[PDB]
């Protein structure tokens, strides 16, 4: 019962809040003589220095779990890739508080990686459910040539194949391209109207400008872009009427770290009350042994249930992602974000707010356009 938690938290106020949450969890629920220990380390900008410092300050401290948060800063990386890879050498589980990248989803690339927020899988699920409940049967996918975009495209295709539906065009464009006019013209020369977009901030801004200059902001066009494209230049140039997502609770660091601490404490208590746990290596350098209880801890975390959190029931999918996460269908109105739809418990509940469509539409448009020009 000398468990220690290293974790990686940005800034210092988050570190203090994590320490307070750890102390509160120690003084609540299952309490023993010595539950665990509280430690933390800053998320310094240098990737190599951060990785080496994390290894030195966590492996030597006999850590069982580590919480890592990814700031959404676009200019600098600050990605959890180095810490996740260093933890991948051993079998120490990690939790991603604000990891929105789909690269960590694959278990081969990151073996002992978990997180409490779905990067874009649940976003695509919400897209599919909204399309199903709003009577849409046409998809214009604008997935960029990136790993997260390809993962989102694969998830969307798998969801579509459940109802035996297929998008008429899944054309993709390379990130950073400034010649999306040809792609927009190809999209125009189709039988579909609903457009699904998923790209970076700069790419979203570029395609929004191209759509504005190609008269794609008029009536009959529906945009279901994700949360990543509702900030920065993407939000500045976003045409009115885009139905975006908000990821309710707003990737709140306090709530996420509290839930992570609770889940880690519950899993540690269950592991202690179940069987023995192999001690972590005493030093970051000296041994290359694989943890014999790492897969067991991963399975326990996967099967772990947490209902006392802010989001009620908390469970992990087969890929270690949050299930039934809360999402808000945000519709732009007069260059302002207005809440219309709420997603919770795989349900869609529109509110009294009207979802205004691009071009000043009052009624629900149709995804099928009868061109009457069958070549």
């Amino acid at each position: 019962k000398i468990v220690n938690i290293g974790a990686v938290l940005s800034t210092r106020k988050h570190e203090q809040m994590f320490r307070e949450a750890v102390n509160q969890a120690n003084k609540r629920h299952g309490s023993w003589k010595i539950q665990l220990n509280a430690t933390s380390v800053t998320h310094k900008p240098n990737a190599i220095q951060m990785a080496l410092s994390v290894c030195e300050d966590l492996i030597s401290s006999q850590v069982y779990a580590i919480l890592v948060s990814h700031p959404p800063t676009p200019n600098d990386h600050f990605t959890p890739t180095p810490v996740s890879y260093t933890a991948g050498f051993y079998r120490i589980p990690v939790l991603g508080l604000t990891t929105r990248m789909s690269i960590y989803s694959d278990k081969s690339i990151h073996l002992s990686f978990l997180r409490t927020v779905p990067p874009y899988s649940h976003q695509s699920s919400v897209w599919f459910e909204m399309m199903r409940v709003y009577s849409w049967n046409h998809i214009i996918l604008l997935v960029s040539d990136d790993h997260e975009g390809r993962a989102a495209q694969k998830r969307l295709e798998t969801l579509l194949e459940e109802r035996e539906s297929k998008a008429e065009k899944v054309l993709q464009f390379d990130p950073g391209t400034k010649n999306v006019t040809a792609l927009l013209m190809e999209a125009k020369e189709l039988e579909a109207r609903v457009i699904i977009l998923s790209a970076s901030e700069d790419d979203a801004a570029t395609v929004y400008r191209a759509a504005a200059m190609l008269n794609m902001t008029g009536s009959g066009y529906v945009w279901l872009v994700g949360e990543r494209e509702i900030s920065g230049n993407a939000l500045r140039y976003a045409p009115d009427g885009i139905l975006g997502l908000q990821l309710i609770n707003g990737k709140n660091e306090s709530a996420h770290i509290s839930d992570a601490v609770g889940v880690v404490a519950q899993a540690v208590h269950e592991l202690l009350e179940k069987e023995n746990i192999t001690d972590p290596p005493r030093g970051c350098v000296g041994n290359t042994n694989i943890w014999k209880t790492g897969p067991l801890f991963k399975r326990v975390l996967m099967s772990s249930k947490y209902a006392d959190g802010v989001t009620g029931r908390v469970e992990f999918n087969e890929d270690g992602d949050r299930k039934f996460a809360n999402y808000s269908i945000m519709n732009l109105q007069n260059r302002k974000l207005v809440q219309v739809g709420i997603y919770n418990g795989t349900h869609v509940i529109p509110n009294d707010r009207k979802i205004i469509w691009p071009g000043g539409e009052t009624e629900k448009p149709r995804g099928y356009q009868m061109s009457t020009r069958l070549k």
Partner: antibody
Amino acid sequence: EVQLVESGGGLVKPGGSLRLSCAASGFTLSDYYMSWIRQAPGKGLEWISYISVSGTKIYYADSVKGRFTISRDNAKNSLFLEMNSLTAEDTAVYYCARDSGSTMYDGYNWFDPWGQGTLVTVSP
Amino acid sequence: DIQMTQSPSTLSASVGDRVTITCRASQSISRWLAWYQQKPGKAPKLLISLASDLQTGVPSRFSGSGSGTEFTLTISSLQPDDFATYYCQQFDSYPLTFGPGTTVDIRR
């Protein structure tokens, strides 16, 4: 255009109570964080406190801890600051600005835009 | 807490000359720092966020830099409207300490 209007200032003797009204225009105040910061004439800038969306978490500055009161009106889109036991160190211009707590996720605390501010001076 | 030191306290430069501002923190605060420009008799305005991002409506001449405990602000070309006092506020942890002045002015 976003403009912040500061009012409620004036002359208050030391040990008195004064109310500062921070009028917010061009945006909805309920979905943003606000803070008060003072700057003594010829000195640096000192942050006072911040008001959360829920209003249950305010971090008063150590110099003014337990003496000031902060309130907000979502319907009026205005911020009201209450100060008590004013002293010589309170002779500074107080500015209310939109914080960055709700900008991306949390934690960031850059202040923009800044209003013209108001001057509070104590004189017996 | 965290104390930021700017050296020199007062500096001058001519119009069109490169301007460098040095901000040093007491401890390593990664890149959680912001820059402000306060005109005489006017409230400060945010210029650089996270010491590496340029805010909208701000000319591209301003360019922040630095990481960890040392930060540097660089201006490609000085202009008359840039004559003001600059600060490097940090938000690593409460209290939100504010950096000292810079007092950018002209050299005769």
